[PDB]
Amino acid sequence: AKWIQAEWKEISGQLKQVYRAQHQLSTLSKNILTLIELPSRIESESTVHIGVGEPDFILGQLYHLSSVQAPEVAKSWAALASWAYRWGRKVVDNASXXXXXXXXXXXXXXXXXXXXXXXXXXXXXXXXXXXXXXXXXXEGVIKVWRKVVDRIFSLYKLSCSAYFTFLKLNAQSTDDMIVMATLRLLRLLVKHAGELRQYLEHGLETTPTAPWRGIIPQLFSRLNHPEVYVRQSICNLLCRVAQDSPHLILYPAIVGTIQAMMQDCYSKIVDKLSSANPTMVLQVQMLVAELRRVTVLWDELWLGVLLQQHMYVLXXXXXXXXXXXXXXXXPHEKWFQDNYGDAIENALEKLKXXXXXXXXXXXXXXXXYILRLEEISPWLAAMTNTEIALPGEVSARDTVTIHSVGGTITILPTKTKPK
16 A cells, blocks of 8 residues: 555556446556455445545555454554545535435425435534525425435544544554544544534543543543533543543642533542542642642732832722732731731821832842741641652653652742742
């Protein structure tokens, strides 16, 4: 097949002749024809002839032959799957005898032609189809429409089955192929969900969890699809992947947990993950909350607010901002409260404005670095013998648990001054 693809300019004629002879020739032509008709999830010309060229059909048939004769090699499945997907993407885009007889018998000259044209003119699609039929003709039309719609997705069905089988076999191939197959399957499940849900709904319930460990963010981002079974399937897959591999859906799911579609799924995912080790889940949640609290100290927030207020001074907005800042701020906590506890009193006295300038100057002078874990957050200190995972261990067969946290925290002397 690779050699045929290389010399596609001088091999198209032979393939066309072979195809013509099949539906009714040098040594190579007769040899390929004989190999194709070997006696033995199938390819039929009644559906692949909606845009696919005649010589292009021989390649697909050869790939199918390789997959049927060698059901253990993943390369054969990958090749057949890629060909089916590539041609399906084009036939569907370009598309958007027994049928005519069935329609005529069920609906027993220009009317028939108009009805036939409207049955596949552009095939919430049910409402549009009904409106078009009523406006054109004016029931068996629904059956014909569903049959033709399901028939057009033959290539997609074959590609889906091939990808599922290939992934199952690789439960041996480069990670690039696995990533490409997973991305293509996800795109097929999102773009065309209801058109071929009968295949994805069943395929997603038996694939392993290892091949789906590289596109987790994509799965999480696609949780708000305007569908019902799509979100449920994604949530089930994520929950299944959580088992035996919790260090991959731990931080994203917990961070997201702290429209209801973007929250309900996260709730069930975190619940399923916590059904095994609830103590670890609660500990990581508390750790995340503590980190968020220690992110920006009250001193830095107050200094920034004072600077912004002073810059925007040259009213109601200033008073509201000051009140909100004071309300948000009610070892380090007690020290700040006892060192700058007159801010509320000063603001109230000045309400009826040197207090703001004095506070800003004092904060700026006190800003000019070493911090202690006990003073910053007592929860972080004394933490030990924890089975939590490190923040980011995508490629780690033997995950390393956090033993302790450094007691000294420094700050960079940059614009944002990170910790």
